[PDB]
Structure formats: C-alpha cells, structure tokens
Amino acid sequence: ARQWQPDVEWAEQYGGAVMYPTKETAHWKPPPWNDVDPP
Amino acid sequence: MLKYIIPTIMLMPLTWLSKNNMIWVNSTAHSLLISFTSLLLMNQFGDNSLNFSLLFFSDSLSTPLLILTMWLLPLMLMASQHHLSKENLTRKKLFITMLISLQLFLIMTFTAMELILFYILFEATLVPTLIIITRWGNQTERLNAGLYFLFYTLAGSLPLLVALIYIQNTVGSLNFLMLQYWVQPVHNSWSNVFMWLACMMAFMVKMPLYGLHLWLPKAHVEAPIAGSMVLAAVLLKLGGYGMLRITLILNPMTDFMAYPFIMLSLWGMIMTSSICLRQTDLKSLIAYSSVSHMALVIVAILIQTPWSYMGATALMIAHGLTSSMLFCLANSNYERIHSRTMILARGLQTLLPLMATWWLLASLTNLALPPTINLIGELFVVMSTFSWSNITIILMGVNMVITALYSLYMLIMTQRGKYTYHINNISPSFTRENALMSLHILPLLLLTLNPKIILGPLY
Amino acid sequence: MNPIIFIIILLTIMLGTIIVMISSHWLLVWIGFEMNMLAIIPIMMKNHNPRATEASTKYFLTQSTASMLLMMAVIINLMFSGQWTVMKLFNPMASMLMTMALAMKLGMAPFHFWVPEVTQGIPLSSGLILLTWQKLAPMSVLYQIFPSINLNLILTLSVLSILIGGWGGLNQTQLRKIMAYSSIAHMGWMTAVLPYNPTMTLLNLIIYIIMTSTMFTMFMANSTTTTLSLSHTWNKTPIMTVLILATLLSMGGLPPLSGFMPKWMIIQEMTKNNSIILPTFMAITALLNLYFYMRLTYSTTLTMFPSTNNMKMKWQFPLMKKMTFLPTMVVLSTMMLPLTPMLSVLE
Amino acid sequence: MSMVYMNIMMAFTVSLVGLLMYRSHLMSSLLCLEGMMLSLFVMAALTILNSHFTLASMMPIILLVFAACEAALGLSLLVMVSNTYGTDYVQNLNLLQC
Amino acid sequence: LRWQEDPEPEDENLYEKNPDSHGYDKDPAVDIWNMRVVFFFGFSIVLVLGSTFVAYLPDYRMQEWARREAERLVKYREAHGLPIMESNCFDPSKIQLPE
Amino acid sequence: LQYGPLAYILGEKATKKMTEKSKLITVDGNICSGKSKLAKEIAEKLGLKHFPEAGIHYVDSTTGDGKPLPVQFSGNCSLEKFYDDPKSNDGNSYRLQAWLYASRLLQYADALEHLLSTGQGVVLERSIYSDFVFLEAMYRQGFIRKQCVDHYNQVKKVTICEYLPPHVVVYVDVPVPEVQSRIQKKGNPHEMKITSAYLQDIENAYKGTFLPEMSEKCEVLQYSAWEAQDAEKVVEDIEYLKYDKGPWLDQNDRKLHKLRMLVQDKLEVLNYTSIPVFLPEVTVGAHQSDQVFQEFTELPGRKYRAGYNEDVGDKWIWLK
Ligand SMILES: CCCCCCCCCCCCCCCCCC(=O)OC[C@H](COP(=O)([O-])OCC(O)COP(=O)([O-])OC[C@@H](COC(=O)CCCCCCCCCCCCCCCCC)OC(=O)CCCCCCCCCCCCCCCCC)OC(=O)CCCCCCCCCCCCCCCCC
Ligand SMILES: CCCCCCCCCCCC(=O)OC[C@H](COP(=O)(O)OCC[N+](C)(C)C)OC(=O)CCCCCCCCCCC
Numbered sequence A: 001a002r003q004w005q006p007d008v009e010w011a012e013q014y015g016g017a018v019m020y021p022t023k024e025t026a027h028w029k030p031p032p033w034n035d036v037d038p039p
Numbered sequence B: 001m002l003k004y005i006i007p008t009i010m011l012m013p014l015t016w017l018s019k020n021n022m023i024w025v026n027s028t029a030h031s032l033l034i035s036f037t038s039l040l041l042m043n044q045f046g047d048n049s050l051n052f053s054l055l056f057f058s059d060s061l062s063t064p065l066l067i068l069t070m071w072l073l074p075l076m077l078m079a080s081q082h083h084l085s086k087e088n089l090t091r092k093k094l095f096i097t098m099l100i101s102l103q104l105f106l107i108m109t110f111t112a113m114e115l116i117l118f119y120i121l122f123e124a125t126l127v128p129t130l131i132i133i134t135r136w137g138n139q140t141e142r143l144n145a146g147l148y149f150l151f152y153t154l155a156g157s158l159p160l161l162v163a164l165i166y167i168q169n170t171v172g173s174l175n176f177l178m179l180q181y182w183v184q185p186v187h188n189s190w191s192n193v194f195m196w197l198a199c200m201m202a203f204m205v206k207m208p209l210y211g212l213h214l215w216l217p218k219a220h221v222e223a224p225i226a227g228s229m230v231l232a233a234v235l236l237k238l239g240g241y242g243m244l245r246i247t248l249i250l251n252p253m254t255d256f257m258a259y260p261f262i263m264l265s266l267w268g269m270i271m272t273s274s275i276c277l278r279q280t281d282l283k284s285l286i287a288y289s290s291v292s293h294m295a296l297v298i299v300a301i302l303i304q305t306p307w308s309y310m311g312a313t314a315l316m317i318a319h320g321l322t323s324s325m326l327f328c329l330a331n332s333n334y335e336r337i338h339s340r341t342m343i344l345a346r347g348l349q350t351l352l353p354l355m356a357t358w359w360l361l362a363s364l365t366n367l368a369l370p371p372t373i374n375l376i377g378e379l380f381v382v383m384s385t386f387s388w389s390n391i392t393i394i395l396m397g398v399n400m401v402i403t404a405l406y407s408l409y410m411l412i413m414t415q416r417g418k419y420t421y422h423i424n425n426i427s428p429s430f431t432r433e434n435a436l437m438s439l440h441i442l443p444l445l446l447l448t449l450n451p452k453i454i455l456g457p458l459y
Numbered sequence C: 001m002n003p004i005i006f007i008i009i010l011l012t013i014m015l016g017t018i019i020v021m022i023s024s025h026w027l028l029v030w031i032g033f034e035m036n037m038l039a040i041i042p043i044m045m046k047n048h049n050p051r052a053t054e055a056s057t058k059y060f061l062t063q064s065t066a067s068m069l070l071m072m073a074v075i076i077n078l079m080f081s082g083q084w085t086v087m088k089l090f091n092p093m094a095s096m097l098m099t100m101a102l103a104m105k106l107g108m109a110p111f112h113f114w115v116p117e118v119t120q121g122i123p124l125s126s127g128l129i130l131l132t133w134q135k136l137a138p139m140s141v142l143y144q145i146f147p148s149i150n151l152n153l154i155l156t157l158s159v160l161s162i163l164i165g166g167w168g169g170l171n172q173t174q175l176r177k178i179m180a181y182s183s184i185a186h187m188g189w190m191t192a193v194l195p196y197n198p199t200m201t202l203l204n205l206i207i208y209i210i211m212t213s214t215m216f217t218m219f220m221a222n223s224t225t226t227t228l229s230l231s232h233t234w235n236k237t238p239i240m241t242v243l244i245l246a247t248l249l250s251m252g253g254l255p256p257l258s259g260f261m262p263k264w265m266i267i268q269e270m271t272k273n274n275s276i277i278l279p280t281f282m283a284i285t286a287l288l289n290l291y292f293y294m295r296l297t298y299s300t301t302l303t304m305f306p307s308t309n310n311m312k313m314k315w316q317f318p319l320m321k322k323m324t325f326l327p328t329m330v331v332l333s334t335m336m337l338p339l340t341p342m343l344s345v346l347e
Numbered sequence D: 001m002s003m004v005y006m007n008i009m010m011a012f013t014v015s016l017v018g019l020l021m022y023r024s025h026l027m028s029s030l031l032c033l034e035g036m037m038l039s040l041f042v043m044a045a046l047t048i049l050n051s052h053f054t055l056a057s058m059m060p061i062i063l064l065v066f067a068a069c070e071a072a073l074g075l076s077l078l079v080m081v082s083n084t085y086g087t088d089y090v091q092n093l094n095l096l097q098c
Numbered sequence E: 001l002r003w004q005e006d007p008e009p010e011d012e013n014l015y016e017k018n019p020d021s022h023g024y025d026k027d028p029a030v031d032i033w034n035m036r037v038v039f040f041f042g043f044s045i046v047l048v049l050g051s052t053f054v055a056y057l058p059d060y061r062m063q064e065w066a067r068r069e070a071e072r073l074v075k076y077r078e079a080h081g082l083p084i085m086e087s088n089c090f091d092p093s094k095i096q097l098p099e
Numbered sequence F: 001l002q003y004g005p006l007a008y009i010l011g012e013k014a015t016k017k018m019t020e021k022s023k024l025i026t027v028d029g030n031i032c033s034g035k036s037k038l039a040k041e042i043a044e045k046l047g048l049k050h051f052p053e054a055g056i057h058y059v060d061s062t063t064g065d066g067k068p069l070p071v072q073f074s075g076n077c078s079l080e081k082f083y084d085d086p087k088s089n090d091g092n093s094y095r096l097q098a099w100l101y102a103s104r105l106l107q108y109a110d111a112l113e114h115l116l117s118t119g120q121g122v123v124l125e126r127s128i129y130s131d132f133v134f135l136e137a138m139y140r141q142g143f144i145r146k147q148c149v150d151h152y153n154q155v156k157k158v159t160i161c162e163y164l165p166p167h168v169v170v171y172v173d174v175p176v177p178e179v180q181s182r183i184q185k186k187g188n189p190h191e192m193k194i195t196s197a198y199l200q201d202i203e204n205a206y207k208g209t210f211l212p213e214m215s216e217k218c219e220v221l222q223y224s225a226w227e228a229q230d231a232e233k234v235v236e237d238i239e240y241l242k243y244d245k246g247p248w249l250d251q252n253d254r255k256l257h258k259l260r261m262l263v264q265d266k267l268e269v270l271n272y273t274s275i276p277v278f279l280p281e282v283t284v285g286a287h288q289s290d291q292v293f294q295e296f297t298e299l300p301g302r303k304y305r306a307g308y309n310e311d312v313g314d315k316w317i318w319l320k
C-alpha cells in the first residue's frame, strides 16, 4: 500500500469562511484573494 | 550519565554526514555499541544507589529500563528499513533523527534526580512520538490518533506540574534523595485528596488505566512499526516508573485512595483480555493485550509491598520485550499482504516454518509460561495481592485463563488451519526479519538464568 | 507612499511608545498614546481598499474612546491627590477607568471584538506591528500602577481573554484572525500574573513578541493569508514548513521549547501565593490554543496537501523577501528553555 | 467635591453613553467624542484654577491641541468612508465580519 | 478524476533481482555489510560478552557479603548466650517515649 | 546595488530615465496574421526591445542556463495535443491556457522592469490584456467547461489590476477565410485542423470586447493585412500619437517606485496564479507533485540558489 495523503474533499474542509457551518454563518463568502472589493 | 548522553547526540551528526547508502548501516552499528556500554550501570550496591552528580543518578529501578531503552533503538532501525525504502533521502534522515532524539529524552528521564527535570523530559517525549505517528503512518486515521495521543496525556500532565511546584514550595526541594529523608505523612483533607489525584492521574493515563485508554488502540494501530515498538515497550513504562517514584510522598493516603484505581485495574484486566478474543485486527489485538498486563503493574504499585515492587519491575521489562516482539511479528505479515485483518492470511506455518517458531515462543511468554521472567513478575504480583485480599485470586486466576485463550487463538488463527488460496506472494523470511525476532527473544530467555538484575531496588 | 515618509511615520510610532516608557507625568503618557495612534493609521490605510478603510475606522473609534477614559482617570486622580506622577492611583474609581482604558487598548476580553477584524483588514506587516509593538505601551503603564489595580477586575479580564481567545480560534481559517485570537489568549496570561510578580509579565511579553514575530515573518515570505494557501508551502519551500511546525509547537507551550517557559514561571509565581485553582484552569484552557495550532501543523508540515499545476513555475525563482532576523528569531523561539534562569536580567 | 463638579462630571457620562450607542451617522458619534474632551477640558481647568496650580495652567491647552488633532484625523476617515459607500452610515462598515 | 495523480506503484520483491538478498538493502554490497554489523555487534558482542559480563558482576547488591556477615554474627551471638535476633532494632536507652 | 528603497532615496527615480520615446507597444491579431514580422520590424525602427511571444517555455528561457526544460516540469501541457484532441478528458485543454496566462503575466512584468529600469521601450505580442480571446474561443466550442472560465477570471481579476496598460495597441486585421488559407499554406501537421468556428470566435472576441474596451485607455491603431506590410507607415503613425488618455498620465516617481518593487520580485507576480481553487484540470495530487519536485532539484544548476551550484563551476561558495 501507499501512505495516504489528503485529497480534494479533505482540503475543501479548510477552504470555507468558517470551520463549523451554521444557519447564521451561511452566505459568508470567503474574503477576496487580495483584500480588494468591487468599487 | 554524560558517558551515554553525548554518544547518543553524536548519532545525529553520524546519520547526516554519512554516505547516502550507509545511513542504515552506520546508525545500527553505533547504536549497538552504545547499548553494549550500558551494562556498566549495573555497579549497584546493596545500601546506597549510584549517584553520579546533582542532575543524574541510577538505582536498580533505572538500570533495567535504561538498558532496555538503548537496546530498542537498534531494533527499531532494522524494522524501519523496508517501508522507508521509497522515501526520499532527506525525510529518511529526519525519521532517524526523531528516533535518536526520543532515546535522548528517555535516558535522561529515567535518570533525572530532580522531579521537575523528570517532568520536562517526561513531557518532551510527546513531540518526537507525535511526529512519527502523524507523518509516517499509513492510514487516514493517523491524524486523529495523534490528537487523541496528545490531549489525553496533557490533560493529566498539566495538573501534575502544579502539584510538583506546590511540593517544592512546601517541602523546599524536589531532589529525590532529599525527599527520602524530608518526606512527611499526608494528612486526610479535601485539599490532600486532589494533591494525590494530580500526582497520579498523569501516570494513570500512560500505563494506561482502564477507562483512560482509548488512545492506545488508536496510537498503537496507526503508527509505523518503530512507533509501535517504542510506544508499547518504553513509553508505557514512564507512567509506571513515575508512580514508583512519587508514591514515596503520598503515604498514608494511598491506603484508601488506591481503592477506585485497584477496582478499575482488576476488573479492567478482564475486560481487556476478553476484548482480545473478538478483535478482527491483528495489530489492534496486541494493543489491547498491553492494557491487561499494565493493569497488573498498577495494582502492584498501589499496594506498596516488597514483593509487589519486585514483581512490578520484572513485569515491566518482560512486557517490553514480549510486546515489541509481537508487533514485529504482526508487521512481517503486513509487509507481505499489506493488510491488518487477522482472518486474511491463514495457515502461514505451512509457508514460513521458522517464523512460526518465533510466533510460538512469543505466545508462550505472553501467557506467562514458567520459568520466564514474564511469569516471575506476574507470580510475585499475584502472591502480594493474595496478602492484600485473598479474594483477588479469583480475578487474577480468571485473567490467566483468558490470557492463554487469546494468546493461542491468535497463534492458531494465523499459523494453523489451511492457507488462503488467492494469497500467493508469501515470500520466504529475510535474514533481517529473522534476526529481528532473535534479538527480542534471546535476551528475554537469558534473563531467566540471572533474574535478580530486573527485580528492582527492593531485591 | 514615499520611502522617507514611511521611515518618519514608523519612528513616530516608536517615539509614542518610548514617551510612555520614559515619562513620570500622566500628561506625557497620554501624549505618548496620542502620538502613537496618529502615526499608525496611515500604515493601515496604505493599500487603499474598502476593507482597510473599515479596519482603520474601527481602530480609531476604539483607541479614541480608550484614550478619553484614560484622561478621565488622570483628572479624577488629580482632584483627589493633587499630583500628576506616574504611580499608584489614589482613587478606586480612577483605577477602574484606567484599568479599563488599558484593557480596551490591549484588546482583552470583553473589549476584544476589534482585534480579529482590524488584524484581518490590514496587510501582514501592519498586523505584525499591531500585535507586537502596540502592546508595549499599555503593559508599561500596568507595570507601574499594579499596586492599586482591583484584583477581581484584572483577574476577571484575564480569565475571559484566555477563554475567548481559545474558543474564537477554533472556528477560523484565515491566518490573520487566528493570530488575533492567539494574541487575546496570551494577553490573559500576562495580566494574570501581574498582581503577583510583574517580572513574569515582562518575560511572557518578551517571549510572545519573539514567537509572534517569527510567525508573521514566515507568512509574509510566501504571501500566505489563508489556511489553504499555507498548505502549498511544502511544494515551494520545504524548509519553511519545518520552521512553522517548531514555532507552532512552541507557542502551544509544549516542552522542551521556549514557549513553555512563561507558562512554567507564571504557574510557579501563583502557587507561591496559594493560587491553585486559577493556574490549573488557565493551563487546561490553554489546550484550546494548542488545538488550532496543531490543526495548522496537520495541513502544513505533517501532511502533503493537493497542489496546483502553475506551482511548477514558482520553482524557477528564489525568495527575494527580506526575512529579517528570521534565523535568529526562530532559534530564540525554540531553543531557550535551558537558559530559563536568565529571566533575572529582567529584574 | 462641589456643586459644579456634579454637572461637569455628569456631562462626561452623557457623552460617553452617547458615544457607546451609535444610531446611523458616523458624524454624530464624532461629536459625542468631541463633547467628551470639552467636559474634560472644563473639569481640569476648574481644578487647576481653584488650587492655584500655576504651572498646570498650560495643561488644558495641551489637552485641546491634541484632542483637536485627533478630531481632524477622525474627520478624514469619515470623508474616506463617505467617498466609498456614498454615505457615512456605520452599517456599511460591516465587511470584516467574515 | 477530481485531479491528476500518479497511480499506486507495485511492491518490489528483493528476491527477484537478488536471490542471495538478506533483506536489508537493494544494493548487494550494502545488503551484506548491513547483515554483518547486525550479526557481529548484536550477537557476538552484546549478547555473548554482555551475558558473560553480567555473570561475573562483583557481588551484585552485596548479597554474598550479607550471608558471610550473618554467619559471623551467629557464631558470636550464639556462643555467648545472647538471643539470636533481638526484638528491638534500636537500644531503648535513647528512646524517650511521650509522658 | 540591488534596487530597493535605499537606491530610490539615493536617486534612482523612473522619471529621470524615461523620455517621450519610452513606450510599451502590443501587436495583436488572429492566427497566421503576420504579427511576428510586423512586431519585429517596429522594434528596430524605433530602437525598442522585442519580446518574442510568450510560449509554453518562456519562463525557462529566463532562468537557469536558458534552455527549455523537459515537458514534465511544465505541467505536461502540449500545444500540439490541443489541436489533435481539443476534447481530451485529461484537462490538457484548459491546463494549457492557464499556464500560458502565467507565462504572459511573467513576461509583462519583464517588459515593465526593462522599461522602468533602463528607459527603453518594448514591443510585445499578445500581452495578458488579450489572452482572453482564446479562452472565449475554447468555451464556445465546448473545449473547456464553464468552471474553467470562472477560474480564469478569478485569477485574472487579482493580477491584471496591478499593472499599467500598454501605451499603444496595434491590431492587424485579417478576414477569417484568408487566415484559414494561410494555415494550410504553412503546412503544420497539427495546426491545419483548426476549424473555421475556432478562428471566428477569436475574431468576435477581438472585435466585440477587446478593442472597444482597450481604446478607452490606449492609443489603438488598426490595420489590414495589406497595410501591415508597410512598416514605415505604421511607425510613422506611432510617432504622431497624441497620448492624451490612459492611466499613464497619473504616474509619478512615487507610484512607479511601487510598481518596480513588484515586477522585479517574480514570486510576488506569480502569487495568485496558484490560488487554492481545486479544479480537476489544474489540480495535482500530493504523490505526483512530490516526485516531480525531487527531479526538478536534480537538474544541473538548480539544486541551490543561482550562484551556489558547484556542479556548474561556481566558485567562492564558502564566502558568498
Ligand atoms: C525533537 C523535539 C523538538 C521538535 C522539533 C520539531 C522539528 C523536527 C523536524 C523533523 C520533523 C518534521 C516533519 C517531517 C516532515 C517534513 C520534512 C520535509 O518534508 O522537508 C524536509 C526538509 C526540506 O529539505 P529539502 O529542501 O527538501 O532538501 C534538503 C536538501 O537536500 C539540503 O540537504 P543538505 O545535504 O544540504 O544538508 C541538510 C542539512 C539540514 O539543513 C538544516 O536545516 C540544518 C538546520 C539545523 C538547525 C537546527 C539544529 C537544532 C538541533 C541540533 C542538531 C545537532 C545536534 C548536536 C550535534 C552536534 C554537536 C555539537 O543537514 C546538515 O547538513 C546537518 C544538520 C544536522 C542536524 C539535523 C537537522 C534536523 C534537526 C531537527 C530535528 C530535531 C532535532 C532535535 C534535537 C533536540 C535534542 C538535542 O529538510 C530540512 O532541511 C529540515 C531539517 C532542518 C530543520 C531545522 C529545524 C530547526 C528547529 C528545530 C529546533 C529543535 C528544538 C529542540 C529543543 C532544543 C532544546 C535545547
Ligand atoms: C539597535 C536596535 C536594533 C535595530 C535593527 C537594525 C535597524 C533596522 C533594519 C535596517 C533598516 C533598513 O535597512 O531598511 C531597509 C532599507 C535598506 O535598503 P534596501 O534597498 O532594502 O537594502 C539595501 C541593501 N542591499 C540591497 C544591498 C541589501 O533601508 C532604508 O530604506 C534606509 C533609508 C535611510 C533614509 C533615512 C531618512 C531619514 C530618517 C530620519 C528622519 C528624521
């Protein structure tokens, strides 16, 4: 066998706005990649 | 103890400055040389322990555990060569660095004269151990196993730090020699009940005590082979060694505080043996087998009799050699069929006749066949507990029956029977594997001839 | 921004903090704070985007309000004692406002809601100043007025900071917010031992600055601000992941690393004063910090996360970031436990 | 203390409570912030003049100079907030929740 | 597939390319020298000399001396009328009991 | 003296070295439109530095010894296999476009660094401002999925915002049928499969969106295939441009100092071209990436920092 390393499903658990989704925290899009918002 | 600390440090430059194809050879040879010099610690006197300096000392309890610790590093290096083959050069030399830094902390832990220096090195072993499990384990469950192994230990260690500092402020010193002459009896008060719990629960989580053991079937299963060997051969004995030292300053409160922890161990000794009869994983079967034996050590330490301590010390050394041997055996099968299910590869005695001889000897020591030191240590604990309460023979007799049942059920399941037809890649046993088993079993049997060097300070 | 103006503004941030530390007059202490807040806003607005504008606004309102409360404490202290000297305050009501004004500036709970948001809306270099340098001035005043601080107030703010820093950090994926909550948690330790031994307040502050500065420096080298973006480091700079593992373990207090020294000495100075419940509760709650530190160690160094195709274009260029004092800071963050008795130089 | 101090001391409390309860406008709160310094200015000047603390007669002027410099920095941020969202409402400044 | 990834390789049997392999290493030169250091330092030195070293330890824990000492005291205390072993470990002349 | 804040204070401003002939010119057009010849002639006439169009191996031309590297160190993406199998299931369609944008982004920084550090203008072919034409062509023919288009825009919108647009855009126009005829004449075994629709989509992207949006901030010169052959006429027009628009009129020494500090550090330019958006076309597993990284480190003169490789005859390592 081969040592297991994370796949896309595992990594997407850390790509959200918050670790523990709830009702209030839904719709929280992650911040922009460069801290700039549309004018 | 500098004559052993400095050589161990020099293994790290040796590994990194060696030829790219001689890391396993130089490391193995020089660690074996360090082990040979460890026999000089047996200059033990009948009245006074061996006191080297203001930081380090050795007595009859430290010597057997130190010699065992330095004899385990070469064995770990041999067992790790196979599965660390396609690993790149740099990460292989980091793996060996973790093993050496783990031996460096262990030898200083078993010889620290002051009880806070013991705490620092006792806790320092977590870092290298955690890194081995979480970085070189195979399954996806190694990450959660690492978290369980980390936070179980610290939940008990942190209260221990407070208790030790409190003792120094009151007593004035933590030197173990000083405590032997300045120790005062512990009064019965609510504050002193929690001082007792803090000093002990740190060591109960590592034995482990039944109930606080859920990390052991996760760490010992998801770790690499070298992780399981050191985890189940030395690291469990840190707690047992810790208890034997710190019970000096808890009398007479141990008379009644030991009751809840003697019942968990005595009854937990039967739950863990029974769980082995139905485990579907060969490596997890050996892990639970460790909880049962270490339950005897907890009972022996808590009743504080000369026979119990002699039995406790003998049991700890005997288990370390026998448990590490079983993990190696289960690993050799895994390296061929690359699976841990016990009912997958059967009738292996037909294909690997010699490796089944090692299986037989390992099981005989596991079920305490006389005159092995496994039996000597267990017997003395049974004798001591009979004086404590004659009814305990009932529980310690039932565990003997179950112990022989799962020891030989594992032997029969994998060695006897009929071989699996579709498993066709059972190559013969390499000299590396056969030598690995001979370095576990030969010292285990030789100690039967002169068993007084593993009976501890009360011999 | 012109480079010369950048130096001038930075030296004014330093001058404000230095004026607080060399002043025997409450007016110059207040002037020191005002000069410090005036100079730090331009370095927060330097990137000219809405988030930076919002962060600078939330910081101004918080620090402006805190400074007004502080000046109210000074005047009340003048009415009841007729002097301006920087020492114990002579009125219990002056002490409360003074203690609360400094708590707001530091960011202690429950005056903490701005630290995660201000640190998130400003660049990494500005956050490094905010979380390390800006904590020197308030701690200097606390070092001097601690004989009159209300014990139940300072210990109550300390306990809340340790809890809120712990729970707040578990639910974060952004690196800047994780350090912000980490900063709140470590503040509680510094102010918990203050009534008992102020020397250990400085030691924990010095060690915290060294460790925190190391983390921000390594994040700035790879321009990483999210947990995922930090997980590509193993495929770009393998060495930098081993240094992140060691520092993260240090910050968690695991022996034998440097970050165990302050937690070790603070527990000592509290058990001497027959404080057993608080150090135990503080030490156990700190395991929350060790958890979300360990989570970063699993996604950065102890596992190999997925990479992207364009990463191969990065392998052909070196690191041109300054990484000033990074080799020296990382060693001080990990290998100083054998030199623990050196804390006497702080007395 | 005295009868006048009560109203000066109660005027600071009103402005503090006014500053800690925003309605909609950012400009409204800055006024509550400059009301606070006015009360501190009068309260200190009353203490200094009454006690004949001669060298402290310059302190209230220093309080006024720095407090106005801080106020100028506050108005500048308000202008830059209004040039972005078209108004000085505090509810717009809510991007940093996530 | 959700990503590009290398297929799992196959385990290599060290016997196929080296039937004399001892199992330590792929390179036959290293594979043989690995076996000699394990077998020489392991068995020849540690187990054999260590077993002999432990066998001839100089009176471990003073056990032989105690027996020899005991025979001496028995001779003295027995051919003088004194009891073989007194019930008091310390002389009462030094103990001052309460009240 | 490596460029930095200290050098800028000491005098290394940009306006002190820039003249009215320090321009950035981009030549754009469809496939087989002869922009290579036109662009290479505008360079010599005006004395500008010519940058050959950024291909799959542009980055390798700048680092190391300059020679191309094996194809496994560039994503395994091949332009030849895109024409043969544009619908492949291994994602080579979009993976090629994403890598091409990074090379163009890398080159547009080299263009600005040369202009800002020496005062000499440069001429480019299909800068990053026009690389979206091919993306639209692929998407409308079903070569790439809609998610890939979203990924492209996310990376583009956080990178293209940091750079100034070209002073002059020279657009060579060729009707679609004639272009497809020139492709047949050239004789490339693979390129000859370009369908009519693919070339038409590029034309719509150029006409519909690029030029109208690119004229509000640049001096746009449009030419046909026939007119493009008269270089001195094109060069005459470029020398009579008013230059009354664009964001270049708002730049000063302070603003150009920040830009040079950016385009000289190449890891800061390529920062957001590797955002953690897990898309199957551009995602790589852990076991594959680790293996390729090791091989890249074993190439000559790439195990260490440029200047410390002993195997390429570097010296004084023990004092550098
Ligand atoms: C253990 C408890 C503490 C926890 C520490 C946690 C960190 C443990 C690290 C291992 C676990 C990490 C996870 C593994 C997976 C990630 C690895 C990976 O994938 O990337 C591989 C990574 C990436 O390399 P690469 O680019 O892929 O290829 C390498 C090239 O081929 C370039 O290759 P090259 O041919 O050019 O040469 C490579 C060079 C390596 O280049 C270096 O970076 C050297 C840096 C050395 C500075 C740190 C030394 C501190 C420890 C002293 C060691 C000497 C002992 C004394 C012996 C001499 C007596 C005077 O090696 C040497 O030339 C000689 C170095 C000899 C020392 C071995 C370096 C590893 C030491 C760290 C392991 C833990 C040691 C604990 C000892 C404490 C107990 C006494 O390999 C590394 O270079 C990392 C190794 C260096 C790590 C330095 C960490 C410093 C911070 C640790 C502080 C320790 C505090 C202990 C408490 C002290 C209390 C007083
Ligand atoms: C004693 C306590 C510890 C102090 C720590 C050491 C000091 C901090 C680190 C060095 C800072 C540093 O050098 O800043 C970064 C840059 C350095 O130029 P560079 O291009 O980045 O590098 C150049 C060298 N190279 C590329 C060869 C490596 O400097 C400057 O911009 C210097 C600006 C000086 C102008 C001063 C203006 C007037 C100010 C006064 C107004 C009243």
Ligand SMILES: Nc1nc2c(ncn2[C@H]2C[C@H](O)[C@@H](COP(=O)(O)OP(=O)(O)OP(=O)(O)O)O2)c(=O)[nH]1
Binding pocket: F030, F031, F032, F033, F034, F035, F036, F037, F053, F079, F082, F096, F097, F100, F126, F131, F134, F191
């Ligand atoms: N997928 C893709 N292919 C491109 C891109 N730019 C060029 N190509 C392809 C089209 C051509 O087959 C080849 C070169 O195109 P050219 O623009 O250079 O036209 P050509 O070489 O035929 O003649 P020319 O340079 O104009 O004189 O590479 C691009 O941005 N994306």
Ligand SMILES: [Mg+2]
Binding pocket: F036, F053
């Ligand atoms: Mg071309």
Ligand SMILES: [Zn+2]
Binding pocket: A001, B082, B083, B334, B335, B336, B338, E011
């Ligand atoms: Zn295998």
